[PDB]
């Protein structure tokens, strides 16, 4: 649902929170959790979108 | 001495004169535009979003 951008910036203010080591441990590592699925999700997409342009750009049939 | 052919032979010269116009003339402007979209679609590939 939310931007390929928007998840940059949800991404960017997990890593700028956790960095600072200032959290229960039962609370930090619950949303690393959280983390590695936006990183996941997010480097998927950019799969799609990189190989899309390959074939665009190819002279495919 | 009334024979038609001296007036003929000049409108056979004064119509290939016409046929060089329209060729050059064409030809030019066909020119034109297969130059006018190289430029569009050199920028084109400037932009792409793969870097």
Redesign the interface.
């Known amino acids: 649902p939310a931007s390929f951008e928007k998840a940059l910036s949800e991404l960017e203010q997990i890593v700028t929170r956790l960095e600072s080591g200032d959290l229960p441990l039962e609370e930090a590592l619950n949303e690393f959790e959280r983390g590695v699925q936006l990183a996941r999700q997010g480097q998927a997409k950019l799969q799609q ?2 190989q899309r ?1 390959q074939i665009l ?1 190819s002279d495919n049939e | 001495q009334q024979h038609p052919q001296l007036r003929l032979a000049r409108q056979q010269t004064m119509l290939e004169r016409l046929q060089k116009r329209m060729s050059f003339a064409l030809e030019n402007q066909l020119k034109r535009t297969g130059q006018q979209q190289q430029r569009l679609t050199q920028r084109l590939n400037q932009q ?3 870097p």
Do not use: F, I, R, S
Request: proline letters at 14%; aromatic letters at 0%.
């Open positions: 979108a990189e342009v750009l | 792409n979003p793969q």
